[PDB]
Symmetry: D2
Subunit: 116 residues, 4 copies
């Protein structure tokens, strides 16, 4: 699959499990349209969001619901969510891994982009 999301908890040193993830694609009229969504699994990974056919060129937004994650663990975090916005498939189809590393007052995001 062309798009995968992986989330890690920097406080517990574990995958961040059951984290909600919403993906949007920028429409011709410049609005964000719902593209796909899901929950991270026991391994902190979210697979199967889309397909090579559906994941065309465009600007995508991946919004990770970090706030609900921390609140379920009893922590009141700083951020409302982590939001990753990028142009995809601009030089042909690629595989994208979006990784986020979460702490209550900080997060980091990296993309690993490989060929098919």
């Amino acid at each position: 699959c062309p798009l995968m999301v992986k989330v890690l908890d920097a406080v517990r040193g574990s995958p961040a499990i059951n984290v909600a993830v919403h993906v949007f694609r920028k429409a011709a009229d410049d609005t964000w349209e719902p593209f796909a969504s899901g929950k991270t699994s026991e391994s902190g990974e979210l697979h199967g969001l889309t397909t090579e056919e559906e994941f065309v060129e465009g600007i995508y937004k991946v919004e990770i619901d970090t706030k609900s994650y921390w609140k379920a663990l009893g922590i009141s975090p700083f951020h409302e969510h982590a939001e990753v916005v990028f142009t995809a498939n601009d030089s042909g189809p690629r595989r994208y891994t979006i990784a986020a590393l979460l702490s209550p007052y900080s997060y980091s995001t990296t993309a690993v982009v490989t060929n098919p």
Copy 2:
């Protein structure tokens, strides 16, 4: 200075200078409305965005134009920008520093909330 933004460059090991920063506040119709903006100085810092009277509780977005920065350096970037979204709450501490550390395919952001 209730809100300061600081940007660092992980490739060159330097302040990220002349980086455009826009700040928005969530309006009651769920739309982002522009609030403040500027460009980081030679020290990679952006001071004077707002004041204590203006910076009321609310949900705020800080959008950092990382793509233009990397473009000025001739390095292909992954992200369109870095967007930091948070609720400002009064009972907590009085000053917010939003720090971001930039790489072409990665960024990290941290809030340092004091006083």
Copy 3:
């Protein structure tokens, strides 16, 4: 395997390939003794460093040769290496993933620690 190392390049958005990794274990006399070593593969991962039998409790050091990596890419980086030092297996055997995310003047390291 109980210990795995994963290295990512934050400039190219790719796994960091052929990165040298040296693992040491603190001896009774407080010196660092050579424990294991290897190179990251095409996926930026290094598997097979040790075994459940050999990976006993102790203080371990994982030294990642980031400087040779950047220099081979034409970059003169800040750090000599990235060095991760931790107590392992103190409450029984665990699986450790040591991940490092590399930029020329910055790096981050995280541990994902799971049960067998």
Copy 4:
């Protein structure tokens, strides 16, 4: 101030205060020898470690006692410490800030090298 260390806490969103920091210089027999040390202030900063005359080219280690910090907060940490090792070179810029951002199972360190 040729060398400054700054430490931030990613769990609390605050300067990491009272954190012990030791600095070593590689000696010709490959051994680390103590050079300077201190504890971070209320702003999470450690100033005055060395001087321009003393801080000659060499290989240096900055060891940050992150484990004691997390222990004082009652949070189980993964690392024994954070160890930042670098070559100081004169032709480059004149001032080094070693910044570290701490979480219990993760840290990041960046060098900001200016003037």
